[PDB]
Amino acid sequence: TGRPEWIWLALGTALMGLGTLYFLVKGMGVSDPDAKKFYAITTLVPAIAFTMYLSMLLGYGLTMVPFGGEQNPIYWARYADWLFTTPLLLLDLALLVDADQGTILALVGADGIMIGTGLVGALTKVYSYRFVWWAISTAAMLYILYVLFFGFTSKAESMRPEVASTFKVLRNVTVVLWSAYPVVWLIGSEGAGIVPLNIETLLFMVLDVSAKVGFGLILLRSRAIFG
Amino acid sequence: TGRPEWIWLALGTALMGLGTLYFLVKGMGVSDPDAKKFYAITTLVPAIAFTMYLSMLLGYGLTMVPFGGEQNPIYWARYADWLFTTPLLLLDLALLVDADQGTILALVGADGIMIGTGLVGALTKVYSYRFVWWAISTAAMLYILYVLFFGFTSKAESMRPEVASTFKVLRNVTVVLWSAYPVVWLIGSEGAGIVPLNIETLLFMVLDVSAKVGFGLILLRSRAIFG
Amino acid sequence: TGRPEWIWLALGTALMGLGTLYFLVKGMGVSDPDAKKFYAITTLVPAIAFTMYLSMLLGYGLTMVPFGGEQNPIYWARYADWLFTTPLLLLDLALLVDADQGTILALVGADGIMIGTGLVGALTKVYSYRFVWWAISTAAMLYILYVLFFGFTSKAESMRPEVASTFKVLRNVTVVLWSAYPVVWLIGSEGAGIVPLNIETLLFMVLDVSAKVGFGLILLRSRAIFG
Numbered sequence: 208t209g210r211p212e213w214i215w216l217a218l219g220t221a222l223m224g225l226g227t228l229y230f231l232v233k234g235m236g237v238s239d240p241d242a243k244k245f246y247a248i249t250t251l252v253p254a255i256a257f258t259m260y261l262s263m264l265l266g267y268g269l270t271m272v273p274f275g276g277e278q279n280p281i282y283w284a285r286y287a288d289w290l291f292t293t294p295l296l297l298l299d300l301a302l303l304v305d306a307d308q309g310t311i312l313a314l315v316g317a318d319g320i321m322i323g324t325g326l327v328g329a330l331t332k333v334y335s336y337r338f339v340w341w342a343i344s345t346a347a348m349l350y351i352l353y354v355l356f357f358g359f360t361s362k363a364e365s366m367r368p369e370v371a372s373t374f375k376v377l378r379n380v381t382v383v384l385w386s387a388y389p390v391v392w393l394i395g396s397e398g399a400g401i402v403p404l405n406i407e408t409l410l411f412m413v414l415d416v417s418a419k420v421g422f423g424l425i426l427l428r429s430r431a432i433f434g
Numbered sequence: 435t436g437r438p439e440w441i442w443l444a445l446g447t448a449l450m451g452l453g454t455l456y457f458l459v460k461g462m463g464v465s466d467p468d469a470k471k472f473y474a475i476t477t478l479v480p481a482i483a484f485t486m487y488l489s490m491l492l493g494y495g496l497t498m499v500p501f502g503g504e505q506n507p508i509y510w511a512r513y514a515d516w517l518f519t520t521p522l523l524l525l526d527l528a529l530l531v532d533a534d535q536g537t538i539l540a541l542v543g544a545d546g547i548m549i550g551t552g553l554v555g556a557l558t559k560v561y562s563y564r565f566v567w568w569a570i571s572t573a574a575m576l577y578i579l580y581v582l583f584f585g586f587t588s589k590a591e592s593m594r595p596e597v598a599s600t601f602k603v604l605r606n607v608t609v610v611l612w613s614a615y616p617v618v619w620l621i622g623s624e625g626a627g628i629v630p631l632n633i634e635t636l637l638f639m640v641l642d643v644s645a646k647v648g649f650g651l652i653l654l655r656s657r658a659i660f661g
Numbered sequence: 662t663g664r665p666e667w668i669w670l671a672l673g674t675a676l677m678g679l680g681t682l683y684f685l686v687k688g689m690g691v692s693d694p695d696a697k698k699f700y701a702i703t704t705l706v707p708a709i710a711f712t713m714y715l716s717m718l719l720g721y722g723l724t725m726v727p728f729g730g731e732q733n734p735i736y737w738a739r740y741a742d743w744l745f746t747t748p749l750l751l752l753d754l755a756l757l758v759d760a761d762q763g764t765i766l767a768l769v770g771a772d773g774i775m776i777g778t779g780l781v782g783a784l785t786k787v788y789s790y791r792f793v794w795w796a797i798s799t800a801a802m803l804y805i806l807y808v809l810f811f812g813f814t815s816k817a818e819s820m821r822p823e824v825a826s827t828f829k830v831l832r833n834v835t836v837v838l839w840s841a842y843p844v845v846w847l848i849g850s851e852g853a854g855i856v857p858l859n860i861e862t863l864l865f866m867v868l869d870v871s872a873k874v875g876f877g878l879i880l881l882r883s884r885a886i887f888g
């Protein structure tokens with residue numbers, strides 16, 4: 208159930224909270240409309256994560272789902288968060304590399320399906336079905352990582368060195384971090400309950416804070432965000 | 435209830451599924467950013483339809499609603515699908531004709547209301563009220579078909595013949611197909627239960643597959659999508 | 662509970678309804694793509710408000726939430742409305758002043774959080790927590806009013822007099838009107854139940870109709886919306 212993981216939820220809330228404040232207090236004197244975009248997108252990512260982490264700490268983002276033959280604790284807030292949060296990160300990568308609107312739409316589309324589908328799976332009552340949805344969700348993610356890695360990099364090679372290198376660091380961080388989510392999910396309370404909800408929430412916390420604050424820090428502290 | 439229509443749901447899932455694969459495997463070597471947009475938009479339409487048709491086949495997209503004096507089987511997944519799916523189709527028509535942002539916003543707005551309002555109606559408990567919502571939803575749709583037929587055609591007359599003719603075919607297919615939905619709804623399990631849920635699901639399946647795969651095929655196999 | 666406020670809900674439905682019709686019947690012969698945008702955005706604001714006010718009058722937009730030690734009547738339809746309705750108004754102000762995409766994204770982002778967070782609060786079961794969410798929601802709003810007042814005005818000073826003056830009127834109307842919502846909420850049935858649901862619904866009605874129809878009238882009847 209949901210009680211012993213309260214500490215990882217409280218620390219996540221705190222970290223996202225400070226992360227938001229920090230980025231806010233850094234983009235204040237930014238005149239460049241391009242840089243402005245990056246700060247806008249990158250700052251909202253942790254702000255949203257903050258509200259959803261708080262809904263979990265306070266119990267609102269937790270629901271109970273019966274499957275297998277039991278009542279399981281499902282933190283649904285994560286999907287609400289990721290629904291808007293993952294496309295924003297992808298938007299950062301797209302602007303940095305100047306991606307075609309066509310591809311930006313395909314990624315956002317793929318990403319919405321990846322999260323929607325993941326939510327469905329998490330709330331499904333027939334234990335066996337949850338893994339069908341997991342399969343579909345992972346197929347979507349692979350498609351997004353494929354484009355970021357092979358498609359975007361190519362696009363980044365045409366920009367100046369500062370942009371290409373920063374994109375390369377962000378690229379490696381998101382590909383590695385994002386792929387940990389489906390595994391954590393599969394082995395956690397949403398799938399085969401091998402790992403306790405306690406450790407699971409700690410894993411997501413490290414992944415979420417790394418994928419947003421870390422990502423943001425790497426991006427917002429470089430000169431790439433400028434023209 | 436929901437059991438005998440499983441075959442139309444399974445066939446729809448299959449068809450949307452293959453339809454997605456096919457479009458994916460066709461836009462692969464497309465360099466034109468314009469064409470890229472059309473493939474992106476047109477491919478996501480069936481992909482979304484696939485996930486929602488699967489949620490209905492697996493039972494997740496089905497809920498029970500009391501009205502009249504009974505518990506009625508309401509497939510709510512359809513609205514989730516159409517919410518993002520109908521505006522994307524409209525986006526295809528808009529790009530093909532180069533519509534004003536003002537009008538694109540009015541259509542997407544009208545369309546969101548048409549689906550939201552339709553969802554409300556489907557889930558309302560006071561039998562009589564469901565038809566008030568149906569009335570509002572149909573008013574919205576008529577407004578969208580009006581613009582597509584009279585407004586868009588005019589816009590299409592300024593493009594080269596290939597574009598004008600393809601737009602004309604797509605225009606006639608969507609106007610005819612879309613107007614069948616409110617009728618199916620009115621005479622189906624969501625309204626006056628004249629037609630059984632069995633036949634109803636078969637009707638929607640033919641309409642959905644025609645409105646997306648068919649539409650996509652007509653669009654993606656022409657040279658209109660190019661500059 | 663929900664019954665004696667039916668009259669304010671019926672009058673709101675009526676007013677939004679007529680307000681929509683009127684704007685529709687005024688933007689008909691508009692050729693200017695810019696003006697077209699304003700009519701599109703401004704017209705959908707009341708159209709959405711109409712569907713949500715109707716869902717409240719008909720009872721669908723009302724739910725029951727236990728907190729304090731009682732079952733409280735929570736009109737959740739308001740959030741559905743405002744979710745899309747407040748960002749559209751902000752879009753009007755942004756176009757009128759020609760705001761940077763960066764800032765438009767920050768405002769829409771801030772605004773989505775303000776409404777989402779407000780919804781959460783309204784539906785939370787732990788009485789004390791509802792005010793934490795109220796605090797976060799108000800912080801977001803203050804951030805939006807800050808930018809509109811200090812940021813946008815500056816942007817408006819570079820436009821021609823007609824635009825600057827209309828923006829100034831709209832600016833003062835929204836800053837004053839918007840700030841009344843959190844107070845009404847805090848002292849209404851969603852917070853410290855000082856004011857009865859009866860008077861509360863009357864307050865929101867005057868605020869909603871003023872913030873949309875009024876706003877729209879001031880905007881759509883000026884020459885500012887033109888190039």
Ligand SMILES: CC(C)CCC[C@@H](C)CCC[C@@H](C)CCC[C@@H](C)CCOC[C@@H](CO[C@@H]1O[C@H](CO)[C@@H](O)[C@H](O)[C@H]1O[C@H]1O[C@H](CO[C@@H]2O[C@H](CO)[C@H](O)[C@H](O)[C@H]2O)[C@@H](O)[C@H](O)[C@@H]1O)OCC[C@H](C)CCC[C@H](C)CCC[C@H](C)CCCC(C)C
Pocket residue numbers: 251255258266267268269270271283286287288290291294295326330724725726744745769770772773774776777778780781784
């Ligand atoms: C403008 C855009 C384009 C914006 C669109 C936003 C919208 C569409 C997002 C939806 C996101 C999705 C992904 C999340 C939804 C998940 C969904 C499946 C889960 C739904 O449940 C939660 C929902 C409803 O809450 C509830 O109210 C009902 C009505 O009163 C009740 O009937 C429900 O029961 C109630 O559910 C709650 O309580 C349950 C309690 O049960 C009990 O448990 C306790 C335990 O101690 C005890 O045992 C009791 O006895 C027992 O009964 C609990 O189980 C439930 O889980 C739940 O707590 O909530 C609505 C959430 C709201 C939508 C989230 C807001 C998220 C943030 C703030 C969004 C910010 C977004 C901006 C827009 C992004 C901007 C950037 C872009 C530009 C890119």
Ligand SMILES: CC(C)CCC[C@@H](C)CCC[C@@H](C)CCC[C@@H](C)CCOC[C@@H](CO[C@@H]1O[C@H](CO)[C@@H](O)[C@H](O)[C@H]1O[C@H]1O[C@H](CO[C@@H]2O[C@H](CO)[C@H](O)[C@H](O)[C@H]2O)[C@@H](O)[C@H](O)[C@@H]1O)OCC[C@H](C)CCC[C@H](C)CCC[C@H](C)CCCC(C)C
Pocket residue numbers: 270271272290291315316318319320322323324326327330478482485493494495496497498510513514515517518521522553557
């Ligand atoms: C980024 C964007 C801008 C994205 C925004 C996305 C979001 C806002 C979309 C919402 C779309 C709307 C239109 C659909 C919502 C409809 C809503 C009214 C219906 C809600 O119900 C379903 C919801 C919740 O599931 C449930 O979990 C709760 C919490 O644990 C429970 O409390 C609920 O009870 C539970 O409901 C399920 O189970 C019920 C079972 O009851 C039982 O029946 C069985 C029968 O055998 C038996 O009798 C049992 O005894 C009995 O108890 C059942 O009745 C319910 O129907 C339900 O199954 O589900 C959340 C769905 C999720 C939001 C859908 C995802 C859709 C897809 C993947 C979206 C892809 C979108 C991308 C974003 C588009 C990209 C393109 C654009 C760029 C244009």
Ligand SMILES: CC(C)CCC[C@@H](C)CCC[C@@H](C)CCC[C@@H](C)CCOC[C@@H](CO[C@@H]1O[C@H](CO)[C@@H](O)[C@H](O)[C@H]1O[C@H]1O[C@H](CO[C@@H]2O[C@H](CO)[C@H](O)[C@H](O)[C@H]2O)[C@@H](O)[C@H](O)[C@@H]1O)OCC[C@H](C)CCC[C@H](C)CCC[C@H](C)CCCC(C)C
Pocket residue numbers: 497498499517518542543545546547549550551553554557705709712720721722723724725737740741742744745748749780784
């Ligand atoms: C394309 C976009 C990018 C679009 C995205 C749209 C989407 C994500 C918007 C979501 C907006 C959010 C903010 C609102 C959700 C609030 C949420 C917390 C509340 C959820 O509840 C309502 C929901 C479900 O209804 C229900 O169906 C379930 C399945 O069958 C049931 O299990 C639920 O119980 C049922 O709930 C209803 O009934 C309850 C009744 O209980 C009873 O009370 C009576 C009283 O007499 C009696 O006592 C009975 O005995 C007792 O049991 C009741 O309490 C509940 O409140 C409820 O009535 O509803 C879905 C709503 C739908 C999503 C709203 C549509 C809004 C409008 C039309 C949107 C227009 C938007 C366009 C897209 C904007 C365009 C412009 C942009 C370009 C900027």
Ligand SMILES: CC(C)CCC[C@@H](C)CCC[C@@H](C)CCC[C@@H](C)CCOC[C@@H](COP(=O)([O-])OC[C@H](O)COP(=O)([O-])O)OCC[C@H](C)CCC[C@H](C)CCC[C@H](C)CCCC(C)C
Pocket residue numbers: 223224225227228231232234235237238239240243246247248250251254257258761763764766767768770771774797800801804807808812
């Ligand atoms: C514990 C916390 C995490 C909890 C907080 C609750 C939180 C959920 C609610 C807050 C809402 C929050 C999500 C909003 C985030 C917005 C974020 C995306 C900001 C990114 O923002 C980007 C910019 C857009 O820039 P601009 O206005 O267009 O500037 C134009 C300039 O004049 C140059 O013009 P030129 O090019 O022509 O030369 O933000 C605008 C720039 C402005 C000009 C400067 C803004 C200053 C700010 C008002 C002050 C910064 C914040 C404070 C340090 C403290 C924060 C308090 C919090 C409670 C709001």
Ligand SMILES: CC(C)CCC[C@@H](C)CCC[C@@H](C)CCC[C@@H](C)CCOC[C@@H](COP(=O)([O-])OC[C@H](O)COP(=O)([O-])O)OCC[C@H](C)CCC[C@H](C)CCC[C@H](C)CCCC(C)C
Pocket residue numbers: 307309310312313314316317320343346347350353354358450451452454455458459461462464465466467470473474475477478481484485
């Ligand atoms: C049974 C199934 C229905 C179930 C599947 C589950 C499903 C729900 C999840 C999958 C996600 C899916 C929704 C995503 C759909 C995306 C779709 C919208 C694609 C439309 O996509 C449009 C393009 C965007 O193009 P680009 O990257 O910008 O190319 C630039 C080029 O270099 C030219 O540059 P120049 O102009 O300067 O000259 O997609 C990018 C083009 C790439 C360069 C090429 C992409 C190749 C693909 C990776 C391979 C195609 C797919 C495979 C045949 C099999 C599909 C497996 C499935 C499980 C993913």
Ligand SMILES: CC(C)CCC[C@@H](C)CCC[C@@H](C)CCC[C@@H](C)CCOC[C@@H](COP(=O)([O-])OC[C@H](O)COP(=O)([O-])O)OCC[C@H](C)CCC[C@H](C)CCC[C@H](C)CCCC(C)C
Pocket residue numbers: 534536537539540541543544547570573574577580581585677678679681682685686688689691692693694697700701702704705708711712
């Ligand atoms: C009681 C009621 C509140 C309940 C109603 C239910 C309601 C919820 C459902 C209705 C949907 C509604 C929300 C839709 C609102 C849309 C709104 C945003 C409209 C704003 O709309 C802006 C424009 C977009 O313009 P354009 O088409 O691009 O014009 C191009 C022209 O050719 C110039 O070209 P040039 O620049 O190259 O020179 O709308 C398009 C302009 C068209 C060319 C003209 C349109 C005419 C209309 C069809 C008629 C107006 C409406 C009627 C008076 C009655 C309304 C009935 C109602 C039931 C629909």
Ligand SMILES: *C\C=C(C)/C=C/C=C(C)/C=C/C1=C(C)CCCC1(C)C
Pocket residue numbers: 289292293321322325326340341344345346348384385386388389392414415418419
């Ligand atoms: C806020 C930051 C990040 C990096 C979140 C990204 C999340 C995902 C890519 C989650 C993917 C899922 C998959 C691939 C399969 C099962 C369900 C998930 C939604 C967890």
Ligand SMILES: *C\C=C(C)/C=C/C=C(C)/C=C/C1=C(C)CCCC1(C)C
Pocket residue numbers: 516519520548549552553567568571572573575611612613615616619641642645646
């Ligand atoms: C996926 C393809 C299509 C063509 C779906 C379009 C759906 C509609 C236009 C549905 C309209 C409705 C109306 C007009 C009235 C009652 C409720 C509906 C939502 C079914």
Ligand SMILES: *C\C=C(C)/C=C/C=C(C)/C=C/C1=C(C)CCCC1(C)C
Pocket residue numbers: 743746747775776779780794795798799800802838839840842843846868869872873
């Ligand atoms: C349709 C018109 C308007 C002007 C609506 C605007 C609404 C708000 C700014 C509401 C703000 C809230 C705050 C600041 C705090 C508690 C919850 C609210 C969502 C009501």
